[PDB]
A paper describes a structure:
Diversity is highest in the envelope glycoprotein complex (Env), the target for neutralizing antibodies (NAbs), where amino acid sequences can differ by up to 35% between subtypes. Here we describe the generation, crystal structure, and immunogenic properties of a native-like Env (SOSIP) trimer based on a group M consensus sequence. We described the design, characterization, crystal structure, and immunogenicity of ConM SOSIP.v7, a native-like trimer based on the consensus sequence of HIV-1 group M. ConM SOSIP.v7 can be purified in high yields, has all of the hallmarks of a properly folded native-like trimer, and binds to several inferred germline bNAbs. The ConM SOSIP was made to minimize clade-specific or individual isolate-specific antigenic determinants with the goal of generating a component of a bNAb-inducing vaccine.
We first generated a construct based on the SOSIP.v4.2 design, but to improve the quality, stability, and yield of ConM SOSIP.v4.2, we added a second intermolecular disulfide bond between residues 73 in gp120 and 561 in gp41 (SOSIP.v5.2)5 and a number of amino acid changes in the trimer interface derived from the BG505 sequence, collectively termed TD8. We named the construct that incorporated all of these changes ConM SOSIP.v7. Overall, the ConM SOSIP.v7 trimer has high structural similarity with trimers from clade A (BG505 SOSIP.664), clade C (16055 NFL TD CC), and clade G (X1193.c1 SOSIP.664), as well as membrane-derived native trimers from clade B (JRFL Env from which the cytoplasmic tail was removed (ΔCT)), with Cα root mean square deviations of 0.80 Å, 0.60 Å, 0.79 Å, and 1.05 Å, respectively. Interactions between ConM SOSIP.v7 and bNAbs PGT124 and 35O22 are similar to those reported for other trimers in that PGT124 recognizes the N332 glycan and the 324GDIR327 motif at the V3 loop base and 35O22 interacts at the gp120/gp41 interface. The crystal structure described here provides a useful starting point for designing future immunogens.
Numbering used by the authors:
A (entry chain G): 32 to 140, 152 to 189, 191 to 309, 312 to 321, 321A, 322 to 354, 357 to 393, 411 to 458, ...
B (entry chain L): 7 to 67, 67A, 67B, 67C, 68 to 95, 95A, 95B, 95C, ...
C (entry chain H): 1 to 82, 82A, 82B, 82C, 83 to 100, 100A, 100B, 100C, ...
The structure:
């Protein structure tokens, strides 16, 4: 009848917490070309084989939209970009007035422009007149077309990305420190939030590739069985809508232009990499997706969209935001593409999208430091898997209209961090047993 | 203006196109004899119209960087003509002018001695109170001759009119020389002679008043 | 299957309208494109302008101010007018059927193609001189046989004395005798008048009398001259 508290250390008890997670990446070689921005100078190597422990009988409530792993990755990716750009060459003296003319082509439109300008030499007193090509997006006319400056120069400073650091996303595993753990939802038809019946724990996540992308998502993971529609609040038009496909549509993006790199020295060790003259034909960049596969994909999307709103479901192009939100922006082989997706959202004869290129870029809505993407030698060609979408409502219950949007980059981290959650262990438990210590 | 090309007889020849392209291209190649109608040999870089022989051919642009060359195999006397390379590329605009002419010349042709025929002034010309001695030179190669006229021993050097050699359907050259005189001057001298020097050799024909 | 035939004046005064006409026999003039090219002496040949099957013209930027090309529908014939001609416009004017090909190097929707024209069938060509000087008829004097080489062969001919302008066409017995004929190039005399000779090598057995007549024709002067030759 006499019960006494008895201390148990190492009980499986946890509470929801937020702590500083760290990078982990599988030991990849990178010998001839190395030091990509996400691996960095040093990231911790993963376990030879990570253990996933199924937690029997556990039901845990998840929330992808109030997840802290997302906010941490976002601030990690931003900080990492600044650490890579810091030692690289800054093109503040490239803000001289530019003498520009159109590039030679058949008279049907001209984006590309051949620009002559004075630039500072390696000697302080001496100046050199050089020419370089720039895309119409990178430049704006100071007064007339006779001469032009770079778009950034009025707003903010610019820095060239070092030619050694690659923009290729690699698998990154986010790990929790000791005394914490990550809970993985194993549930197949898992909604964004709510309880997950089948849960497991891990010390580190799966290999997430940090793919910077707009509108449609690239190289993600595919939702098993039926396609899942995720949203913070379905009735609120202001919050975006993550889609995750089950069958991957594939996308083929190329810049046919056989560009040339022109190393012009702007300086003691400072090497600006301009675009030399293009070799061969003038063909603008584009992306192909299969009309049969897309129309089937967009079909199935409308079916699972009617599970919520349920009624006419229409698709229209992007009508709001900057040039970087409105087009399907992404990176391919170094160059930054900006694809007109008005063909896709207007509901093998492959649908072709007009893609424009920009070298001066401010990603994550960054105001201040602009980045010059150095020109890539030769023809570019990449082939990607389109795994998800980012949609948005116009803001009724008569007809619904879904336009694509990329209002926040966090959505891309959310699309792979939906299934994970951080908790701290609380290993002290006290409970009554018929046991007393020596008096 | 024209650029000269020299090729041995029977040997294959390659004709370089001026103004080589900046992008993908569909050149034409036109054979043009002086005074006669031009005949296109190649219309698209590889393709020839029906009736053009298999000797002539042009370079396709399967991989960019290749240069447009008209290749003639088994070069013969008849191939000697002007060649124009019409250039069309993706970068440059409407190509109005044809290429600079290429004067093909066929070396090591057989030399032919000149067949001279000196005619005295006709009776009806003398009736019109004029006289012209007509020295006609046919079937000679190379087409390069110097005509000197002679009254007896003395050279005339006055009223002499001579055509530069022009090719005929034999692929040899043909030239004619005209010496204008008064009927009284024709009669005054004993005989008149047309000396035609072809290379080292010199052929002379003599005609006198009857 | 198509034959072109240029007809024209031969001579035109400076500061006038040059006209030439190209008779097509093989097919319809509204199926293929047509074009004019000229070969002025001492210069490379010049593409001057073309006319479509749809009746839409395009002219070379140098001569666009002065040129007009037309297509007659009833007659299979196309004309070229050229206003305010000068000494420079002197040339051999060829007409030719042009073919529009399109060369595509990328995607059609984007553009990435260019049209090119090539002239498969040419006409013979019509010579046109531009000069203030008047037309002159040729004087035809017969060149007698010398009675010339060892038998069989002997040589006779016809002299075509000073005329203007080029060309003169010479035949023998109204084109009955073709063997041995050789019409020489004309000489431009200091007078400013061209003179040629046409000769026939005939056997001394055939002379005579076979009654050899040379038929001279000068189209600018409108003078057809037939002349007998005899020892
Ligand atoms: C997850 O949550 C579930 C549900 O809450 C938990 O499942 C329950 O587990 C407990 C044990 O922790 C079970 O209670 C025990 O039941 C056994 C079963 O009886 C045996 O006899 C029968 C043979 O005729 C047969 O019904 C049983 O067969 C099952 O079990 C076998 C194991 O051999 C398994 O292979 C099969 O899949 C079958 O399903 C079995 O043979 C009973 O024997 C136990 O009594 C013994 O142990 C207790 C102390 O533990 C002791 O006091 C007794 O004296 C005796 O020695 C005991 O009653 C219960 O059956 C399960 N299900 C419920 C409640 O619905 C489980 O704990 C959680 N899982 C995990 C992994 O955490
Ligand atoms: C994504 O996944 C899950 C799918 O279930 C879902 O989680 C929960 O959904 C419901 C509806 O959005 C929320 O709670 C409900 O709210 C409605 C409206 O007020 C009530 O009618 C519901 O009452 C039921 O439950 C009662 C429990 O006592 C019972 O009496 C009876 O069964 C009632 O029908 C209920 O209160 C709930 O807030 C969410 N979220 C969580 C974390 O549970 C989620 O909504 C799906 N969609 C989205 C956009 O996330
Ligand atoms: C979620 O549940 C699934 C199936 O119930 C489990 O997948 C198995 O994982 C083990 C490794 O422990 C493998 O040997 C099996 O091959 C897997 N099953 C199948 C059907 O492939 C797992 O417990 C959970 N999922 C994950 C991704 O670990
Ligand atoms: C803040 C700022 O100066 N922004 C510049 C501005 O010069 C220009 O007007 C604008 C286009 O609207 O592009 C950018
Ligand atoms: C990863 C990628 O880019 N493409 C994938 C490929 O790995 C896979 O094998 C194929 C199915 O056969 O689907 C696609
Ligand atoms: C470059 O500087 C020179 C003087 O060194 C000047 O003449 C020229 O105008 C400048 N270039 C342009 C495009 O203005
Ligand atoms: C530079 O700018 C001037 C206008 O002041 C223009 O006339 C000139 O053509 C330009 N030069 C070059 C080489 O583009
Ligand atoms: C969800 O949506 C409506 C707006 O349509 C809003 O009134 C409600 O408060 C929202 N709730 C949450 C949790 O976002």
């Amino acid at each position: 009848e006499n019960l006494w508290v008895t201390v148990y250390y190492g009980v499986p008890v946890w509470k929801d917490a937020e702590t500083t997670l760290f990078c982990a990446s599988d030991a990849k070689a990178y010998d001839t070309e190395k030091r990509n921005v996400w691996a960095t100078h040093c990231c911790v190597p993963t376990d030879p084989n990570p253990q996933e422990i199924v937690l029997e009988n556990v039901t845990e409530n998840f929330n992808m939209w109030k997840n802290n792993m997302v906010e941490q990755m976002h601030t990690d990716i931003i900080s990492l970009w600044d650490q890579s750009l810091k030692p690289c060459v800054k093109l503040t003296p490239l803000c001289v007035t530019l003498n520009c003319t159109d590039v030679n082509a058949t008279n049907n439109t001209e984006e590309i422009k051949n620009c002559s300008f004075n630039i500072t030499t390696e000697l302080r007193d001496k100046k050199k007149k050089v020419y370089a090509l720039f895309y119409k997006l990178d430049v704006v006319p100071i007064d007339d077309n006779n001469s032009y400056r770079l778009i950034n120069c009025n707003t903010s400073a610019i820095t060239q990305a070092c030619p050694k650091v690659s923009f290729e996303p690699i698998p990154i595993h986010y790990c929790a420190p000791a005394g914490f753990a990550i809970l993985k939802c194993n549930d197949k038809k898992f909604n964004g939030t709510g309880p997950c019946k089948n849960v497991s724990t891990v010390q580190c996540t799966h290999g997430i590739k940090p793919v910077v992308s707009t509108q449609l998502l690239l190289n993600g993971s595919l939702a098993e069985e039926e396609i899942i529609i995720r949203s913070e609040n379905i009735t609120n038009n202001a919050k975006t809508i993550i889609v995750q496909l089950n069958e991957s549509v594939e996308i083929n993006c190329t810049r046919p232009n056989n560009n040339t790199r022109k190393s012009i020295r702007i300086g003691p060790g400072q090497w600006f990499y301009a675009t030399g003259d293009i070799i061969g034909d003038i063909r603008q960049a584009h992306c192909n997706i299969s009309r049969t596969k897309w129309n089937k994909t967009l079909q199935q999307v409308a079916k699972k969209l009617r599970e919520h709103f349920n009624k006419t479901i229409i698709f229209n192009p992007s009508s709001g935001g900057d040039l970087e939100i409105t087009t399907h922006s992404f990176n391919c082989g170094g160059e930054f593409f900006y694809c007109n997706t008005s063909e896709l959202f207007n509901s093998n004869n492959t649908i072709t999208l007009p893609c424009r290129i920009k070298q001066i870029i401010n990603m994550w809505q960054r105001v201040g430091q602009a980045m010059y993407a150095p020109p890539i030698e030769g023809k570019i060609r990449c082939t990607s898997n389109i795994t998800g979408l980012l949609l948005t409502r116009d803001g009724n219950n008569n007809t619904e209209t879904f336009r694509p949007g990329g209002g926040d980059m966090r959505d891309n981290w959310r699309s792979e961090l939906y299934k994970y959650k951080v908790v701290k262990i609380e290993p002290l438990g006290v409970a009554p047993t018929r046991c007393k210590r020596r008096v | 203006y024209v650029s000269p090309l020299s090729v041995a007889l029977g040997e294959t020849a390659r004709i370089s196109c001026g103004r080589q392209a900046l992008g993908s291209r569909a050149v034409q190649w036109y054979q043009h004899k002086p005074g006669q109608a031009p005949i296109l040999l190649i219309y698209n870089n590889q393709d020839r119209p029906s009736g053009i022989p298999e000797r002539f051919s042009g370079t396709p642009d399967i991989n960019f960087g290749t240069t447009a060359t008209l290749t003639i195999s088994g070069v013969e006397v008849g191939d000697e003509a002007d060649y124009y390379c019409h250039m069309w590329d993706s970068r440059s605009g409407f190509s109005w002018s044809f290429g600079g002419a290429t004067r093909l010349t066929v070396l090591s042709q057989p030399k032919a001695a000149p067949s001279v025929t000196l005619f005295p002034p006709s009776s009806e010309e003398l009736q019109a109170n004029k006289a012209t001695l007509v020295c006609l030179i046919s079937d000679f190669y190379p087409g390069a001759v110097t005509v000197a006229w002679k009254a007896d021993s003395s050279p005339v050097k006055a009223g002499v009119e001579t055509t530069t050699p022009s090719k005929q359907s034999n692929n040899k050259y043909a030239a004619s020389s005209y010496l204008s005189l008064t009927p009284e001057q024709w009669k005054s001298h004993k005989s008149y002679s047309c000396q035609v020097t072809h290379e080292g050799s010199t052929v002379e024909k003599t005609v006198a008043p009857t | 299957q198509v034959q072109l035939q240029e007809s024209g004046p031969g001579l035109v005064r400076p500061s006038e309208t040059l006209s030439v006409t190209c008779i097509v026999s093989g097919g319809s003039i509204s199926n293929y494109y047509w074009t004019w090219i000229r070969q002025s002496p001492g210069k490379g040949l010049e593409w001057i302008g073309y006319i479509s099957d749809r009746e839409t013209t395009t002219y070379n930027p140098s001569l666009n101010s002065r040129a007009v090309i037309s297509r007659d529908t009833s007659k299979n014939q196309l004309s070229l007018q050229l206003r305010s001609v000068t000494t420079a416009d002197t040339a051999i004017y060829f007409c030719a059927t042009a073919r529009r090909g399109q060369r595509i190097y990328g995607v059609v929707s984007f553009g990435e193609f260019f049209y090119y024209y090539y002239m498969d069938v040419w006409g013979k060509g019509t010579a046109v001189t531009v000069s203030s000087a008047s037309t002159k008829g040729p004087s035809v004097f017969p060149l007698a046989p010398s009675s010339s080489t060892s038998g069989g062969t002997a040589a006779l001919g016809c002299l075509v004395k000073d005329y203007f302008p080029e060309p003169v066409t010479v035949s023998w017995n109204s084109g009955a005798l073709t063997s041995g004929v050789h019409t020489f190039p004309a000489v431009l005399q200091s007078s400013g008048l061209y003179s040629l000779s046409s000769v026939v090598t005939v056997p001394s057995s055939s002379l005579g009398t076979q009654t050899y007549i040379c038929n001279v024709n000068h189209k600018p002067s409108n003078t057809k001259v037939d002349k007998k030759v005899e020892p």
